[PDB]
Design an enzyme around this catalytic site. Structure first.
Site, mmCIF file in Angstrom:
data_model
loop_
_atom_site.group_PDB
_atom_site.id
_atom_site.type_symbol
_atom_site.label_atom_id
_atom_site.label_comp_id
_atom_site.label_asym_id
_atom_site.label_seq_id
_atom_site.Cartn_x
_atom_site.Cartn_y
_atom_site.Cartn_z
ATOM 1 N N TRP A 66 0.174 21.993 29.419
ATOM 2 C CA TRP A 66 0.633 20.505 28.945
ATOM 3 C C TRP A 66 1.954 19.980 30.351
ATOM 4 C CZ3 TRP A 66 -0.031 23.850 25.357
ATOM 5 C CH2 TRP A 66 2.046 24.298 24.686
ATOM 6 N N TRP A 90 15.580 21.146 19.191
ATOM 7 C CA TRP A 90 14.802 19.762 19.987
ATOM 8 C C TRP A 90 15.306 18.642 19.503
ATOM 9 C CZ3 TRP A 90 14.533 20.860 23.960
ATOM 10 C CH2 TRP A 90 14.638 19.809 25.063
ATOM 11 N N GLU A 110 7.224 26.831 28.940
ATOM 12 C CA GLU A 110 5.966 26.506 27.904
ATOM 13 C C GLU A 110 4.628 26.684 29.414
ATOM 14 O OE1 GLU A 110 6.176 23.384 25.499
ATOM 15 O OE2 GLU A 110 7.798 23.956 24.272
ATOM 16 N N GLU A 142 13.603 27.340 21.475
ATOM 17 C CA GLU A 142 12.864 25.788 20.995
ATOM 18 C C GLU A 142 11.642 26.413 19.483
ATOM 19 O OE1 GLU A 142 11.183 23.160 23.355
ATOM 20 O OE2 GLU A 142 11.886 23.883 24.873
#
Ligand SMILES: OC[C@H]1CNC[C@@H](O)[C@@H]1O[C@@H]1O[C@H](CO)[C@@H](O)[C@H](O)[C@@H]1O
Ligand code: NA
Ligand code: NA
Length: 367
Positions: free
Chosen positions: A174, A321, A169, A286
């Site tokens: 983040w 997840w 990611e 994911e």
């Protein structure tokens, strides 16, 4: 016909990649994170899964997470004990399941977690002041991997193949290795070093390397360019992955359900086209709908859009997840059902689909 970047990969690892390349046209393997470690309403059982409690079968793909290993912790950042994790990896592999591992690496500069955005990548890469730290961190995975080995009657060592999916990611902002916290070139240097160190210096032969940008930060009008932000090169990637929670009903997405279904299909179609051009395998590494609030989520929002387009359908697997345990984590979070959850029957239908494979109907992947 796809070939691994490790030209010397173990027989079992080569076989897994070859068999995923064959199975992908007509089938989709289902995965779940932390599936044997705990569920929403239980923890402690040494052979249980929410997925199995609903369907009667384990997931085909078992995801696991190493964050905290690098700090010498006895359990990961979600309190999964590493010795138990090794046992669970070995148990799943012994049944013919597939193993994949992510790594929410703690921030070495601050000592905070992956969400502490203190810059660190520039320090970790070759030439950086903390390059010794990156080596030490990776060495902890080398040691963990040794605790997965067995030695046969002839004295030969065997390992479970692992789909290793680091630095994920990275087009998001983040994590500390993400856009805004690391330059694109430094991210690429980090990835390339990770492969050189594990494959070439440490001579691990049981890894398949998966790359996994987040869809939510890719412009759908320019998908390939966004997907390839930070891409390290074909000599460094085996699986063209994607984390896409956005097009499957994320609370912040204002697009209609019909627009979202179309976008899911389009994202996977383009993912597959990229993989085909590169001689790789694509996967939805994911996804999921947190707390499973969407009626008929599995068949209508996941399977339907994947099966709608023959390119999209050539992904090899889909993983959802983890099912966080309510008794010890106060934020309700889960992506697979458990008995009595509203989407359980629809999850049974997903399992029952001829396309979708759980552990119980896998062919022998490792020969
Ligand atoms: O929102 C689900 C995922 C999306 N991908 C990034 C990942 O960080 C996020 O889940 C968190 O995963 C970490 C590591 O297992 C966990 O500590 C958090 O509680 C979330 O599950
Ligand atoms: Na497929
Ligand atoms: Na099935």
């Amino acid at each position: 016909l796809p070939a691994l970047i490790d030209t010397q990969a173990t027989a079992e690892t080569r076989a897994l990649y070859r068999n995923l390349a064959k199975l992908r046209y007509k089938h989709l393997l289902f995965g779940h994170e932390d599936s044997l470690a705990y569920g929403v309403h239980w923890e402690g059982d040494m052979d249980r899964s929410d997925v199995r409690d609903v369907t009667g079968a384990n997931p085909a793909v078992y995801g696991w997470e190493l964050g905290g290993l690098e700090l010498g912790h006895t359990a990961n950042l979600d309190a999964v004990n590493f010795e138990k994790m090794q046992h669970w990896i070995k148990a799943g592999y012994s049944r013919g399941g597939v193993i994949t591992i992510s790594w929410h690496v703690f921030n070495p500069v601050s000592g905070g977690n992956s969400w502490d955005k203190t810059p660190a990548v520039h320090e970790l890469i070759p030439g950086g002041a903390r390059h010794a730290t990156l080596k030490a961190y990776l060495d902890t995975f080398v040691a963990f991997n040794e605790g997965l080995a067995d030695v046969d009657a002839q004295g030969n060592k065997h390992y479970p193949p692992i789909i290793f999916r680091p630095w994920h990611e990275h087009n998001g902002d983040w994590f500390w290795w993400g856009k805004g916290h690391a330059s694109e070139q430094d991210y690429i240097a980090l990835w390339r070093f990770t492969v050189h160190y594990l494959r070439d210096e440490k001579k691990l032969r049981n890894l398949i390397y998966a790359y996994s940008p987040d869809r939510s930060r890719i412009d759908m009008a320019n998908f390939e360019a966004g997907y390839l932000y930070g891409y390290p090169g074909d000599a460094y990637v085996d699986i063209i992955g994607l984390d896409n929670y956005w097009d499957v009903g994320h609370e912040a997405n204002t697009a209609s359900a019909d627009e979202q279904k179309a976008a899911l299909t389009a994202s996977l179609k383009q993912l597959v086209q990229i993989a085909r051009s590169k001689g790789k395998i694509a996967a939805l590494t994911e996804t999921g709908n947190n707390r499973l609030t969407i009626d008929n989520f599995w068949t209508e929002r996941l399977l339907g859009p994947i099966s709608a387009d023959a390119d999209a359908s050539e992904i090899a697997y889909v993983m959802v997840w983890r099912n966080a345990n309510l008794a010890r984590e106060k934020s309700e979070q889960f992506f697979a059902p458990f008995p009595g959850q509203a989407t359980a029957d629809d999850f049974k239908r997903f399992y029952q689909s001829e396309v979708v494979l759980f552990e119980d109907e896998l062919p022998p992947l490792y020969r």
